[PDB]
Paper text:
Human [name] and SIDT2 are closely related members of the [name]-1 transmembrane family, and have been implicated in various biological processes such as glucose and lipid metabolism, innate immunity, and tumorigenesis. Here, we present the cryo-electron microscopy (cryo-EM) structures of human [name] and SIDT2. Both structures reveal an overall architecture of a dimeric arrangement composed of an extracellular domain (ECD) rich in β-strands and a transmembrane domain (TMD) with 11 passes, highlighting the remarkable structural congruence. Importantly, the ECDs of [name] and SIDT2 bind synthetic plant-derived miRNA only under acidic conditions.
The TMDs of both proteins consist of 11 transmembrane helices and feature two pairs of conserved disulfide bonds that are essential for structural integrity. Notably, both [name] and SIDT2 exhibit a potential zinc-binding site with three histidine residues within TMDs, which is responsible for lipid hydrolytic activity. Regarding the TMD, while the overall arrangement is similar in both [name] and SIDT2, different transmembrane helices (TMs) contribute to dimerization. In [name], the dimer interface primarily involves TM2 interacting with TM5 from the other protomer and is driven by extensive hydrophobic interactions. TM6 does not appear to play a significant role in the [name] dimer interface. The electron density maps exhibited well-defined main-chain connectivity and side-chain densities in the ECDs, while the TMDs have relatively lower quality and resolution. The truncated TMD proteins also exhibited GFP fluorescence, suggesting that the TMD alone is sufficient for dimerization or oligomerization.
Numbering used by the authors:
A (entry chain B), B (entry chain A): 301 to 333, 441 to 524, 539 to 586, 628 to 644, 681 to 736, 743 to 809
Amino acid sequence: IKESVYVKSSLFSVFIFLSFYLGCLLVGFVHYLYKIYFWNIITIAVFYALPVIQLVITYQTVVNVTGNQDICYYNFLCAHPLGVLSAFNNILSNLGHVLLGFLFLLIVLRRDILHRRPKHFGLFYAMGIALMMEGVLSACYHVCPNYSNFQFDTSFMYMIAGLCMFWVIFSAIHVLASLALSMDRMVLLVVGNLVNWSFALFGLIYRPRDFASYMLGIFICNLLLYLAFYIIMKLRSSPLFCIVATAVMWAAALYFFFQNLSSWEGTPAESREKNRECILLDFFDDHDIWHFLSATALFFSFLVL
Amino acid sequence: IKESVYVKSSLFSVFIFLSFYLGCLLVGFVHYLYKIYFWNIITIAVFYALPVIQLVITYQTVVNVTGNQDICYYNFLCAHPLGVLSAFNNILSNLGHVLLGFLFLLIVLRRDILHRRPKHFGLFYAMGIALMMEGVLSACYHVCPNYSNFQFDTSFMYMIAGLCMFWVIFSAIHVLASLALSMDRMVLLVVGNLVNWSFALFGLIYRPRDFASYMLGIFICNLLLYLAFYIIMKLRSSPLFCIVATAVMWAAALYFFFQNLSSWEGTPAESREKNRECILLDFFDDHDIWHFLSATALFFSFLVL
């Protein structure tokens, strides 16, 4: 494909979130008419990031010089090269993560500024920086996806889970964590325990090869349950468009997520069995669309928060 | 070589460090006649380590299966296999690091306990955990040394330097840092600035290919200068065997360090040009001896502290 589609796709990808900032600017104009944590998080992020970038760039160089293309588990039907990067679409598509995180950080910043002129935003700042780092490190992982660097991809989320605080054993421990985390209170508590136990038994029986998949699945299910709890309790106590947008963006996100176009758990030939052609602007594939809706649904859900 | 030399060498190492503990026990019997930082440090250490061992074990598995031995930069004359590890001597030799570190933690612990029954030990505990992690991660790096994981090797020391707070530009910035860190005060300050400047122009002219070596050298020289300052200033104000031992072990450690038997920055054949035969018990090489004396000189140096 010619560079014309390159520039069209890139311009569209940037300009959609540029229009998001533009609309936010109209909203603001219509309305017109704790550094220790920040320093620690920036140091930890930059220092942990540096050598994994070195590692992935070394992998890219060695695969480019050797020509042995089964080292990286790309989407070889929707792979577009530019310079030394042999898969640019998956790199550019993660721009939405960073831009949406920036918009989030700035709205939180102006909220704090207006507050100065238990409503705390420090955890919000930390989680926004977490979104920053997760997006960027996901991009670096997508430079060349392998078994080795997937652990580094989930290492930041493991870090965050640490700071914030065989399958039968896993199911039992998951059940224990679910019950420990959380006239009518007993009924809803039992309902939550039951829905958690259902995913526990799916994890026990199905036995997937991707642990992070179920980790994120229980994550999204638990936070959506808590959001439904918050909305129903607010209703019983006697803006709104974000609540509606959350559900549709997340529904699209899960649809695009459960495609599993690339699977590095097997041999690379088997991972090339599930490749699918480009579907968006002849430049993007299902995984990049998953990136986009994951970013926007994440933003909307935390906007409810 | 037979397993006999394996067991003799391993038993020798473990028993000499056990003799260190035993002598400490005689000393103690003769004398007889802040959790947030700990939790954070252990969490970050474990979580950052985990994918590093995952990556290096993946490297070991792939080199073992494909048989392409130029992936890892070993000491192929002093390489001894055991199980899946193809270089056991470099792994076992780092046992002294963790064992001496454990000694340091226990003596600090008894000192604190006696204190309960501005003398602060929190930084001492943090640096002891640092010793532990540096030793273990150096072992994991020595499983299969390459360009990629050397950055992870220096990553922990970069981490610590962050928490505790083109060559001409580097020399100028080094000079600025040296002068910013630190009748007769002027003369000694000028002397320190002069030796720092001499090392700065040494790095500027020689332009070494190992930045970590340069940083470690300036670290050793600076703390040696500060220790000599402490001794001379205590002398002017009107035990000692540790002070005596520090110099001898550190000089021998530098002697063994400047051998540079393996150099991954070139092609693997050039790194194999500088291989040297086993020298100690027909089981160890110069780098492992550097491991040992680095550990003991480290322990003695902060024993003075």
